[model samples]
Target chain A: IVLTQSPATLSVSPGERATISCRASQRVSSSTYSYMHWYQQKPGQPPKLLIKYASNLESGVPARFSGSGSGTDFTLTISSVEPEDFATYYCQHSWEXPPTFGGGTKLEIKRTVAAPSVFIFPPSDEQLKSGTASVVCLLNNFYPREAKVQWKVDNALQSGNSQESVTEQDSKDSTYSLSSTLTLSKADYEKHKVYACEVTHQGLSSPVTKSFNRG
Target chain B: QVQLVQSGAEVVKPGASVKLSCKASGYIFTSYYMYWVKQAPGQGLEWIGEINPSNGDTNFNEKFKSKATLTVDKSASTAYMELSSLRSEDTAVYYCTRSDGRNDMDSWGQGTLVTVSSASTKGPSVFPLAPSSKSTSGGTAALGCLVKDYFPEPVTVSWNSGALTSGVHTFPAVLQSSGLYSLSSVVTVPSSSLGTQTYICNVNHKPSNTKVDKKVEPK
Candidate 1:
């Protein structure tokens, strides 16, 4: 019996249509059954389950995504918008009694063109057997600041080890935060535990690979 | 469309400390970040930090920073976690996740189970390859200390750092699948001391049965 999700920040772009809303603390159950639910949180990843009781639609999710109102008020739309669909959007309420959420709505994506989110940290296989293991590979932000990195172990190609960084500048947003390292051992990460990191910029047209996440 | 309703089971004892709550609804309350998790049973999810429900600004996890503490209540759009001193490894289940402003979804919170039996030593997580790394003044370098996910492991790494007192190295503690236990070692500084060098690197992984010396300086 509690909820509140409004405006929050949906700066949007990329062919629009977003609606976002959710309100409750009372009604939630006069009964029509939709218990209200919806989620999507991409940016580090882990909160995916879009629309459930309030308007059903959670199979593989996609149909522009939607969900309409109910007891305490609801609405969670998004049709068009795609840059991976920006992110941050929540709402829940399994019909009262310990179960709630709603304090999120961060889908910031102003311009359109993009590339450079990469990611690959993960080093610590005993420091890859004393070689002082590395691995990094951040490269967030991504704009015309330039980009070009490469590495691959199990897939082949990773010639002369690597190390890069010299593009900081992002005091609050001018965007640019590179990093690239790749030096391993543990028999090159036990051979096939898999590892990769590729990025070629100019907003990317053909190069953009990312891997390494033994989860 | 948000739902995170929790707060129930709790059993406290050793060094006691508990505080968990999560109450959310819907209708846009804007974003400020909010996250917390610690599920120790089948073991796996371990991330206990994050909060700024408008203006609290926190970011913990040096293994629970100083042992968890994150709060928020934007008038009750709740989110809180306290976990203090407690032990028995602070028994299982704890969650209050919601931060769709940049990942962290499934808007959890139907979880709450904070037990704590007798005691359980604590110490180990001084992790820092370069503390924050600020290198290059010339050549040689070696200063690392990572005793990650510590627990009741066979831990013990040492080095003093000066005239190169034998740059120690020991890596034996390994055990995956979240149930913590990692081990690392490095201590080879002598490329002219990088102009300013100093490392402590001591840990006696029984957590705190005594053997503390973790400086690993650099920022």
Candidate 2:
């Protein structure tokens, strides 16, 4: 059977609520009881049991940590995150004889870092397509590696003609890179209008955007 | 807001089957199409299939037609994709999206993460092999139990109830190409008693603390 955990990585402020999710591939309960459990693990340490049978807290567990769910869906909620609670959490079940564990969810504290560099590349001026042009946007050296990239034509959001690459990591420096492309028709390209690439990242105080004009 | 909510992440051993669901909200259940996409770990996306809830019409990418089956429940406003014959290559995040057509996805379901693991710690498959009678009247009958396809072994197989000492033979554990092990045990019984006696094989897998019992009769 499979056990599922969500949001592989999560960041929360100390004293804020942190809700983690775990889903069983199938029902892990009988009419009498549930066989699901939750655990917390830190670097270089064995996992510590937090809850059993889905919701019962282990003895001595602080009240802030709780569990609730049955059958195939479940949740582990930390009412208030503490500095010490920054660690990886996992959920497992025992109903099917050989128990299975879900992938761990890493709970982390928000960190400060520099913003990524963003750039937009326009199609070659010489290769003017019969009636179409393409523009590409690239983001490099981003930290946290989680960011949203979008394309806008003037003040409206563009869709259907855009593609984005998976965020890739630079193993040498531990930074990240992502690129997105936008395609425009002949009319849209010759109109001499503004096209923009915007990126939102945790490291940035505000969204970073770059503009391009056929002009 | 039109919403597409998906089921949770999943981790399963290779060869298992999986079904993931997407529940729709704030939209007419039968008005639009639902699309299924797959994104392997650190990889790009592949279109698995799509379903039109309105008429139960469907289409699938040629490569995924054999790998996935898409269906919907109009009453519940939910769509499902069932995947089979899974292997390590099937590990990915499967997403459900709402679109006017295949090219545009306006609303997205939080992807369901699926991991196809070739895990090491697994239980054993135990069963009895057919029995052989050596003589017609009263010689000896041989009964066998075979335990196979398990990992990290120190497994115990017992005959009739517990361990055997006399007229019993156990072969060495053999490793298979699939990284699993097999062990066979045979015991000799009096042929005269074969017709009226019952023989059983009990297997204990220590790592998982799982037990299996099988009975065989020689004719």
Candidate 3:
């Protein structure tokens, strides 16, 4: 039986809930027992068996740590992540001769980083003179490496010739930077009263936008 | 600060029975659960069962139901596992662990070595006066002890000193071409500390009641 764990990594602050999912390739239970188990492992230590037979917490396991599901799908949830709960979790099924274990989910302590610094740069004057203009949205110092960058012209989304660079990391501080460019004709750039770059990141409550308009 | 002190190793004849003990301390014994696990030489861990010291309630792995009987002495805060109808396959290190709230086993006892061999087993013929070799790399030294020509497979190997746990690697007994068993134990220590300190390789061939020790100091 093959086991799969989703979200390879989970980041949550203390006191927050963390749910990890594990799925089996086939049913992992019998009429009497669900043979799925969960384990927690820290660096340099052996895996500690936490949940047995899917949902039953071993003898003294805390109530905050729980498990559920059976057959092909299972979940291990920590009601409130604790300071000491930062570790990798694994799921295994023992219904067959050789047990199968899910890849693992690493629970990390979440740290709130500063929001990305958004800057929208209109194409160079020389490029505009050539009939086409490209607007670049550069987001710097953002965390988590995943952000949604979009181009909106005159209140409408523009998907024409848009390319986003792979998020790059800043080694010194471990933040990320990415740039999305939208190419449009000079006539379109001139006709649009407002050209804005919208960015959504984990650090922000709502999407942040920086607009460039012909004032 | 919870502790689990296990009973010493045992060497028993095939078809006989042996009872292993695990004593608990530093925690409310009855309030927690104790689990027994088996690790055959060179093999992985196998769950035997779990016992509640408070009520003497027990749950066992189906495979071990007929072979193992788990019991507890509340007054002594100790857990016991008695395995009957022992055979060569039962040769393994059994461990008792105290289950914590989050990660089941927060405290572990040094495993109890159980060797099930035939009554006609032969003891190791070669007991080196010193380690076969002492090699140092960087700040650590690797010391090897060679024990050879024993029969019926099982032998208990350990160090009399040096923290006694971690850093000591023991190999399962290999059946040589001559129908004898041989094995080795390697102990790693700080290179600089070896010259003044002495290390002992203690080999116990249980069924035959053969005990041998080799003492060596780095040059």
Candidate 4:
């Protein structure tokens, strides 16, 4: 059976959770012993077997790595990613003739540790008088591309007309960056003295927020 | 301590041919079979073929018989595979592996990335080869679904009737043209599923960002 691994690459910080998945073209079951195996490989070094079959760790290997799942879907999870753990991971099938390894997935970054900072670019001062305007939330310097944007008018959780996250691979650096925009109408936002834009990212301990005009 | 060290990366023009080298060590090169595998970008793994370094005998997966030629240089303790008439689908990382003797590939070489420049990005047209149906055999029913003509490598065939399934046997994909592949599989289910349940064959092709489904209410 052919094995497919998702996410050609991943960026993660040391000591955080990481999960890599491998799926079979067809079912490779736990019962028939069409066992699946996972391995870690660094550039210029031989691949090291991490997990054999379902969850059995190779002897002398660290316990942070584990494998699970049956049939077609399987996972290789690292409880806490480490610096030396930054390498490509692959999975293979046992009983399939001419055993093969999945395409390797590299770790794009060891510790993408940039905390996201979110600030609102308020609607132009005069545009508020026009009864409707667009509010932009600049969420920048985020290490990981994954982030969630939140808006509040007068401190109540709220929604907006539209929102978009355009991916940005910051120049010359391994970390990622992005910004989001939330359209707001003066009728809904002008009355509230405080307009808060909060950004939630995996790199941050908690959500970071910034306000405009009211704070 | 057995190992297979692979050649460097390559970037070649479409329709050109490239030869890959693998130097074997850590055991008698003639003692074990050396196999070559392919991994397309973000795709699944495919075995091209294997060669016996001692006798120069080779066994190729039917799909790769014409597309690949397997040879060995026993005096040099190395094996080589030449992929001819290349296409974008051939743009992949080729790995040379050594069998572990019992039932596994105990030794492997680092992969060599080969990129074919600027080929057509459009994926192949996919169609159903074998429809989902229950075949009565000796009073037992077997459900089968076969898909054909999905290209560029890495298509997943899954049987889904809502919950997860098992007992699926998928034949190896066969290369149809210069850049196309087809595969078929069967999943056994309860006799009660015949005619009443909709057996769904899901083909997830990532290269095209497409997911196709063929549902059959078996007769």
Which predicted model would earn the best lDDT? 3
Candidate 3: C-alpha RMSD to true structure equals 23.4
Model 4, A37-153: lDDT tens digits are 887876334566778776788778898998899888889888987766767888987665555667767765554467754434555444456565545555545666678878776
DockQ of every predicted complex: 0.04, 0.01, 0.02, 0.08
Give me the chain B TM-score of candidate 1. Answer: 0.33
Write model 3 residue lDDT over B20-115, tens digit each, in one string.
999998888998888787766644456787888889888787889899999999899899999999988999888887764312355667787787
Q: List the residue pairs that clash in candidate 4.
A: none
Q: Write the per-residue lDDT of candidate 1 for residues A1-215, one digit (tens) a residue.
A: 55888888776665688788889877775555657777775532346778777788876788988889877889888888765676777786756334556777777655634576554555644455465456655555666566788887777888876656544222233345565656555565555666788789887788877776432
Alpha carbon lDDT of each predicted model: 0.63, 0.69, 0.71, 0.65
Rank by DockQ, highest first: 4, 1, 3, 2
| Model 4 TM-score on a 0 to 1 scale | 0.46
Ranking by TM-score: 4, 3, 1, 2
RMSD of every prediction: 15.2, 27.9, 23.4, 22.6
Question: On residues B59-146, what C-alpha lDDT tens digit does candidate 2 reach at each position?
Answer: 8867888999989999999999999999988987788877563433446676776767665566777655444322121365556665
Candidate 2 chain B weakest lDDT stretch, 10 residues? B129-138
Q: Give stretches of model 4 more than 4 Å off.
A: A2-13, A16-34, A41-48, A68-73, A86-88, A97-215, B1-3, B10-13, B42-44, B115-219
lDDT pick, better of 1 and 3: 3
